[PDB]
C-alpha cells in the first residue's frame, strides 16, 4: 500500500534530468521513435501549413531508473511525470506557427528494465509544400522531419520503430486520403556545427485529395 | 565497523514460530536497510524480507503469508517471526546491510549466521 | 526469476595459482552479478559487485569479468587465506544464488 510510493522516491533522490541516461558518458542514447497519426486536422493550401494531431512515442533505457520488481512487491511499471526525468529533445525542424518541442508533457511508462515509454499528444502545424499544378486533383507529398536539436548523433541516436508511421489510430479524414506513408532516417551536417553530423527522421505521407466537393461546386 | 548479530533458539518445535534478533552495530537503521535471508540445509541461500531504512517492509512472494520483520531503532535491533514452522525451514539465517544505487540494492554486510533446526 | 548455476562444483588448486570460477545464468543479469566468499563458521564477506567493482578492503587479486550471461570470478594468485566457497548472485531481477564453488587446495 505504499511501496509504489517508496520506489518513487528511491529512484528521484538524486536523480538529475540534465545528464543523458547511459552508464558511461562515451555511449550512446538509443532512442526509438515512432510517430502515431491520430487525425490530419487540416492542410491550409494558402499558408502551406499542415496541422496534424499525433502521438510521438518514444522508448528508451534509463540506466538510471532500474528497479528490482521483488523488493517492490512486484510492481513492474508505474507512471511518473515526464518532467522529471531526461527526455530526448525532438523538435519538429519544419515547425510553420506551431511549438517546435513538445508541450503536453504526460505521464510516461516506466518498467523495472529502466525502459521508458512515452507518448505525449501534439498538434503538428508543419511546413509542407503545396503543389498547385493538379489541383484539385493533386497528390501532396508532406513531411514531418523530428529530430533531436542539440544532441548530434554520436551523443543520442535516434531509430524509427518501424519503416511505417502508426495509422492504427487515424481517423479517416473527409478531404484527404494517406495513400501512402514512411520514415526514413538521415544524417545531415549543418554550417552550424561542421564536426559533428546531426539525425533526424523524416516521416512522410503521400496524401490524395478527394475532388468531389470541388468538382461539384467549382468545376 | 559495521557489524550484525543475529540470535534466537537453536531448536523449535514445528508449527511453533521462530523468533530471530539482529543487534546492529556501526551504523543506523534510518538508513541502511537490513535484509533477512536463509540457507536451508542442503540448498543455496534465498532472500527472505527487508526492512527498509524509511520504517517498511517486503517480504518473498512464496513467504509473504508468514513472515513478519520489525524493528526498534532505539536498541538498533531489526525482529524477524515466522509461523507454521516445518522441516524444510532448517537452516542458517543471516541478516545483511543492504548497499544501493539508485533503486537497486544488494547484499554489502553478512552477519554470522543462527541455526535454526526444526524438529519435534 | 534468473537461474544461476556454478562451475566447476568443486575445484582444487595449489597455492599461488590463477583460478577463475565460473557463472552462468538463464538470462541476461546486465553485469548486475556480485560475488561473495563464505568460510565455514564465518560471515559471508562481499568480494565483487556489478560484476568488477571491487569491494574496499578486498586484496587486489581478486578481479571480476563478465557480460551478458556469462560472467568469471579470477583469483591472479591463489593464497591460503582464499580457501573457502564463492557465492555468484543476482540482484536484477529479483534474489537468486549460485549453488557455490567449494576450493581446496591441491594435495
Known amino acids: 500500500s505504499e511501496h509504489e510510493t517508496r520506489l518513487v522516491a528511491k529512484l528521484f533522490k538524486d536523480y538529475s534530468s540534465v545528464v543523458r541516461p547511459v552508464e558511461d558518458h562515451r555511449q550512446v542514447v538509443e532512442v526509438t521513435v515512432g510517430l502515431q497519426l491520430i487525425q490530419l486536422i487540416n492542410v491550409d493550401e494558402v499558408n502551406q501549413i499542415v496541422t496534424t494531431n499525433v502521438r510521438l512515442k518514444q522508448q528508451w533505457v534509463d540506466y538510471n531508473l532500474k528497479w528490482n520488481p521483488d523488493d517492490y512487491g512486484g510492481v513492474k511499471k508505474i507512471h511518473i511525470p515526464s518532467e522529471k526525468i531526461w527526455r530526448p529533445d525532438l523538435v519538429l525542424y519544419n515547425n510553420a506557427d506551431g511549438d517546435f518541442a513538445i508541450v503536453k508533457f504526460t505521464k510516461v511508462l516506466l518498467q523495472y528494465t529502466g525502459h521508458i515509454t512515452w507518448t505525449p499528444p501534439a498538434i503538428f502545424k508543419s511546413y509542407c509544400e503545396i503543389i498547385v499544378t493538379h489541383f484539385p486533383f493533386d497528390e501532396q507529398n508532406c513531411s514531418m522531419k523530428l529530430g533531436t536539436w542539440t544532441y548530434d548523433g554520436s551523443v543520442v541516436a535516434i531509430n524509427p520503430e518501424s519503416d511505417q508511421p502508426d495509422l492504427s489510430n487515424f481517423m479517416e479524414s473527409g478531404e484527404w486520403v494517406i495513400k501512402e506513408s514512411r520514415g526514413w532516417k538521415h544524417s545531415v551536417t549543418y554550417s552550424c556545427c561542421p564536426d559533428t553530423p546531426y539525425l533526424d527522421i523524416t516521416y512522410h505521407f503521400v496524401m490524395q485529395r478527394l475532388p468531389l466537393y470541388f468538382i461539384v461546386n467549382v468545376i | 565497523e559495521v557489524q550484525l548479530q543475529e540470535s534466537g533458539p537453536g531448536l523449535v518445535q514445528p508449527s511453533e514460530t521462530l523468533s530471530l534478533t539482529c543487534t546492529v552495530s556501526?551504523?543506523?537503521?534510518?538508513?541502511?536497510?537490513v535484509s533477512w535471508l536463509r540457507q536451508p540445509s542442503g540448498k543455496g541461500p534465498e532472500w527472505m524480507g527487508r526492512?527498509?531504512?524509511?520504517?517498511?517492509?517486503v517480504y518473498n512472494s512464496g513467504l509473504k503469508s508468514r513472515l513478519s520483520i520489525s524493528r526498534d531503532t532505539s536498541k538498533n535491533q531489526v525482529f524477524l517471526k515466522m509461523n507454521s514452522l516445518q522441516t524444510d525451514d532448517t537452516g542458517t539465517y543471516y541478516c545483511?546491510?543492504?548497499?544501493?544505487?539508485?533503486?537497486?540494492?544488494?547484499?554489502?554486510?553478512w552477519g554470522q549466521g543462527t541455526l535454526v533446526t526444526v524438529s519435534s | 526469476d534468473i537461474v544461476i548455476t556454478q562451475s566447476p562444483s568443486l575445484l582444487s588448486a595449489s597455492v599461488g595459482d590463477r583460478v577463475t570460477l565460473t557463472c552462468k545464468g538463464s538470462?541476461?543479469?546486465?553485469?548486475?552479478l556480485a560475488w561473495y566468499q563464505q568460510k565455514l563458521g564465518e560471515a559471508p564477506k562481499l568480494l565483487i559487485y556489478?560484476?568488477?567493482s571491487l569491494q574496499t578492503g578486498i586484496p587486489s587479486r581478486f578481479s571480476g569479468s563478465g557480460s551478458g550471461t556469462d560472467y568469471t570470478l579470477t583469483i591472479s594468485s591463489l593464497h591460503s587465506e582464499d580457501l573457502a566457497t564463492y557465492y555468484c548472485?543476482?540482484?536484477?531481477?529479483?534474489?537468486?544464488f549460485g549453488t557455490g564453488t567449494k576450493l581446496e587446495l591441491k594435495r
Open positions: 538470462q541476461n543479469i546486465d553485469n548486475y
Open positions: 556489478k560484476t568488477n
Open positions: 556501526g551504523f543506523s537503521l534510518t538508513s541502511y536497510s
Open positions: 548472485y543476482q540482484y536484477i531481477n529479483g534474489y537468486t
Open positions: 545483511t546491510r543492504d548497499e544501493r544505487i539508485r533503486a537497486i540494492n544488494w547484499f554489502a554486510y
Open positions: 526492512m527498509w531504512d524509511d520504517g517498511g517492509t
